[PDB]
Amino acid sequence: ENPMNKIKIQKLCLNICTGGGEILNKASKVLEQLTGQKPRLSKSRLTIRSFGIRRNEKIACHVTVRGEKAMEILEKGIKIKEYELIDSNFSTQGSFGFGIKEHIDMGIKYEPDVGIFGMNFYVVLEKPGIRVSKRKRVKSRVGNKQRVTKDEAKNWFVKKYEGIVLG
Amino acid sequence: VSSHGYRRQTRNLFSQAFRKHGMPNTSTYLTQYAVGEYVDIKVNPAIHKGMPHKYYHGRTGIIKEVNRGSVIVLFNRILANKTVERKVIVGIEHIRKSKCQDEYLKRLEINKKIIEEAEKKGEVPVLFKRQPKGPKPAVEMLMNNIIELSYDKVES
Amino acid sequence: DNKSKKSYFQRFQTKKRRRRLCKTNYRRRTKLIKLDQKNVGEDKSRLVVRITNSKVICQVVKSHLGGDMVVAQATSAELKEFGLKVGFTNYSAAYATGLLCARKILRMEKLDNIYKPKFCTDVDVVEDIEGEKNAYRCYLDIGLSRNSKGAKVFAAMKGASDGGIKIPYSPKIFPGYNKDEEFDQQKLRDRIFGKEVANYMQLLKKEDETKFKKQFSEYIKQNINAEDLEKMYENLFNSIVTKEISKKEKKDYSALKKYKVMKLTKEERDARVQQKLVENN
RNA sequence: AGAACACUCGUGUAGAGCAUAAGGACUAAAGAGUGCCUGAGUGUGAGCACUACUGCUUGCAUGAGGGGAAACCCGGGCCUAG
RNA sequence: AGUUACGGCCAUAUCUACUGAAAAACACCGGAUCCCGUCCGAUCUCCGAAGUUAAGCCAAUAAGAGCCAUGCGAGUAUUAAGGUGGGCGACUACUUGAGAAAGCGUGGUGCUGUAGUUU
Ligand SMILES: [K+]
Ligand SMILES: [K+]
Ligand SMILES: [Mg+2]
Ligand SMILES: [Mg+2]
Ligand SMILES: [Mg+2]
Ligand SMILES: [Mg+2]
Ligand SMILES: [Mg+2]
Ligand SMILES: [Mg+2]
Ligand SMILES: [Mg+2]
């Protein structure tokens, strides 16, 4: 087969949303354990009385992982979801996402004062050369040859983890 | 009633042309100016320092003094039925070199040859004046190939 | 939404060519080149430094109406004449190229014998010798590259200064600067003569000899060792200052015009369309 | 977790913003962020708006001046009123 | 003859699909010890050559969209001067002069400056 032209992970995005006070600190400590990083707190775009959100108030924390560490977390999570995904979960862009309701399934000890949180996982796939669209000098749009398509993303998932993609 | 601020009535003037927005081109900055040249004012709305008053837009004058990034130009104006000279300060982004002397300078180059020979051989130059177009010329015609014209088109 | 209607295309204004290509910053260029109307006969020279995956380029350029004129040029790939075997995009190779560039200039102007070289022993700007002709003057053009402490663009710039050209600079940008203390110049000298890489080579042989072979294969092929670098670089600098490279020859590669493709005639284009209708019916 | 919560990928000539009328101006910015500073210095000339008051443009000299690697810029507020 | 570095005039150069490419370059590419900067060596900064023409850059193709030119529209629309011209008016004929636009047809699809490198 032709080298280059082979799929990889470029990014895994993790986010927890918990609008309020000390809850965000309690949450942040979790992300700081699952990955060796300090996560970025994010703030409310609008003011929404019903949801209990003032504008410019912190509401969530996220962290982005790349390289080897990404492989461990993804394997750890797809197990929790029992290797089962729906055709809804894949985009026209070569990316996919799922959710988890209970952080303790990723293995960490309980500590009853910390609490129970869920988490979103989102995964972005790639082929070499993407740098052409991100570098400062001579920045250009990539060729259709080097994108990742909806079918390819499913094929990669099936191959790599032996999972089942339901219609 | 109308008002009397410094940029009154300049909605049409002092606006960019279609598909020509943005800052000036390099040629604007690399042009060198000298005292005594004739120069022509056209304001660039994107530059906010060294703008002249809108009366002077599209007028041509003569350079009196040259500074780091601006020029002083002499103009004449009628006020209270008398002639007044005016000294206008302009930044180099709002001016272009005038073409108004072009033909005269060519004519001077021809005169400069003749006026030397006129000392050696003649006594006075022929001086090569322009003349307005004269009467219609004479013509000799072969008289085959005649074309007739008629009110054939009825124009309902 | 946008690109769905004709009016989008009809009303659109294109950026200048070198902006579409992301090669030039026009706001920076204009501040750098704009003429002073009172200093007639001033003819500012830019020192242009650019770094490619393969090589370092120094050019000395004067901006004239109609197009920029190149006075002189030097490239790290030419240092192969003086026996440089390795690291053509290294911090040392940046410095060496700036040094080379300066000498070629001062030879043309015949200032070469008046303004002598000086290998990296102070951080002052070049100063006009009394009773002789003034130093050649230039200003640095770094393009779209970022300014930060220890960027390779500034190495070439110090090369040129040490070579005899007058550039104004502040020492804030060199390794060995301190926020509120004197300049530690041994750190600067260290990098110029390649200590930074020797120290990496030495580390890897203790850590992982497999990774060492992967990281430094080209060096191994030349039998260079960490110990050899100072002698290598001292020789390289001296030779630049001492010798001169042979002139280039001109040749007509005209015959390679065979490879150029040519566009279809109208007559062909029409027949091709005609055939396409008939193939369809 | 809903019409409307946070995070992403692709398109995106301005359909946004620019405290305060209306017009003009602005796109690797003049918009949004981040760093440092108090030039919202000091003497003294020449001019533009129908030109007194007022507002602005610009010259030369100085500061144990600022910001920036530097070219450059700054004696209030992007320009036209307070 | 191309490319590459720095440019000039700023779409004949744009936008969308497809296809080609000797040499040398230009790139993608392999790491983070240091200098430097990130939630994140993705970007920026540094140190490298195991791979690859798939991408970009360059070039061709398309009764392509858009842009540029020219012919026609057309002596048409409008307009300066004039008369004891006409009309209740609204407005309009004539005499000596000046003179368009949209649409629609046909052709084009970057040109050049200084230096460097490659039969
Ligand atoms: K009123
Ligand atoms: K406004
Ligand atoms: Mg008026
Ligand atoms: Mg001021
Ligand atoms: Mg102002
Ligand atoms: Mg080849
Ligand atoms: Mg480290
Ligand atoms: Mg990397
Ligand atoms: Mg190919």
Are the C-beta atoms of residues C32 and C15 closer than 8 Å to each other? no
Q: Is B38 helix (H, G, I), strand (E, B) or coil?
A: strand
Query: CA A119 from chain center: how many Å?
Result: 9
Question: Tell me, what amino acid is at B152?
Answer: D
Name the residues in A9-38 having a C-beta closer than 7 Å to nucleic acid strand D: 11, 13, 15, 17, 19
Question: Residue C147 corresponds to which tokens in the numbers above?
Answer: 């300014």
Whether the CB of B55 is less than 7 Å away from nucleic strand D comes out as yes
Residue C37 forms contact with B (CB below 8 Å): yes
Q: Does residue C263 approach strand E to less than 7 Å at its CB?
A: yes
DSSP assigned state of A60? E
Nearest to A73 by CA among A114, A37, A112: A37
- Residues in contact with C115: Cβ distance below 8 Å, sequence separation at least 6, in sequence order: C106, C126, C129, C135, C164
Q: Which subunits count as partners of chain C given 3+ CB pairs below 8 Å? A: A, B
Q: List Cβ neighbours of B13 (8 Å cut-off, separation of 6 or more).
A: B43, B54, B57
* CA–CA distance, A38 with A22 (Å, rounded to integer): 17
H-only helix segments in chain B: 26-30, 102-120
For ion ligand 3, residues whose CB falls within 5 Å? B 9
| C72/C181 Cα distance (integer angstroms) | 38
Which residues make Cβ contacts (< 8 Å) with residue C69, sequence separation at least 6?
C61, C62, C63
User: Residue C78 in contact with residue C235, Cβ under 8 Å?
Assistant: no
Residues 6+ apart with CB under 8 A from B61: B38, B39, B41, B73, B74, B75, B88
In the reported structure, the alpha carbon of residue A107 is separated from the centroid of ligand 9 by a whole-number distance in angstroms of 49
Q: Chain B: give the shortest CA distance to residue C70, in Å.
A: 17
Å: C20 CA to E110 C1': 15
Interface test with A, best of C19, C21, C51 (most A CBs within 10 A): C21
- What are the C-alpha distances in Å from B41 to residues B15, B91, C34, C36? 15, 10, 20, 20
Q: Does C38 touch chain B (CB under 8 A)?
A: yes
Contact B92 C37 (CB under 8 A): yes
Output the CA angle C213-C56-C165, nearest 5 degrees: 135
Q: Give contacts of B30 with chain C, Cβ < 8 Å.
A: 33-35, 63-65
Check contact B-A (3+ Cβ pairs < 8 Å): no
d(CA A152, CA A144): 14
Pairing of strands A8-17, A58-65: antiparallel
Distance CA(A28)–CA(A23), nearest Å, equals 9
- The two three-digit tokens of residue A39, written as one number: 């996560």
Mutation pick from A132, A136, A137, A141 vs chain C, by most beta carbons of C within 10 Å, is A137
CA–CA distance, A7 with A154 (Å, rounded to integer): 12
The rounded distance, in Å, linking the Cα atoms of A137 and C24 is 9
Contacts of C55 (CB under 8 A, 6+ apart): C75, C76, C77, C88, C89
Read off φ and ψ for residue C64, nearest 5 degrees.
Answer: -120, 160
Quote the tokens at residue C22: 């992301």
Query: DSSP E strands: which ranges in chain B?
Result: 38-41, 60-66, 70-79, 82-91, 95-97
Residue of C11, C13, C33 with shortest CB distance to B29: C33
What are the structure tokens assigned to B67, written together? 């500074």
What's the CA-to-centroid distance between B50 and ligand 3, angstroms? 22
Ligand nearest to the CA of B55: 3
Task: List CB contacts (< 8 A) between C65 and chain B.
Answer: 27, 30-31
Q: Quick check: C34 contacting B, CB < 8 Å? A: yes
Q: Which residue minimizes Cα–C1' distance to E20?
A: C261
Contact C85, C107 (CB under 8 A): no
CB-based contacts of B124: which residues, under 8 Å, 6+ apart? Answer: B118
Rounded to an integer, what distance in angstroms lies between the CA atom of residue C104 and that of residue C45?
Answer: 15
3-state SS, one letter per residue, for chain C: CHHHCHHHHHCCCCCCHHHHCCCCCHHHHHHHHCCCCCCCCCCCEEEEEEECCCCEEEEEEEEECCEEEEEEEEEHHHHHHHCCCCCCCCHHHHHHHHHHHHHHHHHHHCCCCCCCCCCCCCCCCCCCCCCCCCCCECEEECCCCCCCCCCHHHHHHHHHHHHCCECCCCHHHCCCCCCCCCCCHHHHHHHHCCHHHHHHHHHHHHHCHHHHHHHHHHHHHCCCCHHHHHHHHHHHHHHHHHCCCCCCCCCCCHHHHHHCCCCCCHHHHHHHHHHHHHHHC
Q: How far is the CA of B10 from the centre of ligand 2 (A)?
A: 18
Which of residues 64 to 93 on C have a Cβ less than 7 angstroms from any strand E atom? 66-70, 73, 75, 77, 86-87, 89-91
Resolution (A): 2.8
Strand E contacted by C6 CB (< 7 A): yes
**What is residue A93's DSSP assignment?**
T
Tokens of B111: 């005169």
Residue A107 carries which DSSP code?
S
Residues of C in contact with A139 (CB under 8 A): 22
Residue contact B26–C30, C-beta within 8 A? yes
Contacts of C144 in chain A (CB under 8 A): 136-137
CA-CA distance, A73 to A36, in Å (whole number)? 12
**Method of determination?**
cryo-EM
In chain C, the residue whose alpha carbon lies closest to the alpha carbon of A133 is C22
Cβ neighbours of B35 in C, within 8 Å: none
Is C65's CB within 8 Å of B31's CB?
yes
Distance D1 C1' – A51 CA (angstroms): 10
* Number of neighbours of residue B79 by Cβ within 10 angstroms: 8
Q: What are phi and psi of C62, to 5 degrees?
A: -115, 135
The amino acid that residue C268 corresponds to is: E
- How far is C57 from C156, CA to CA, in rounded Å? 9
Q: Which nucleotides of D are covered by protein (CB under 7 A)?
A: 1-15, 23-30, 46-51, 55, 57-60, 68-74, 78-81
The H helix count followed by the E strand count for chain A is 3, 7
Chain B residues with CB-CB distance to C38 below 8 A? 66-68
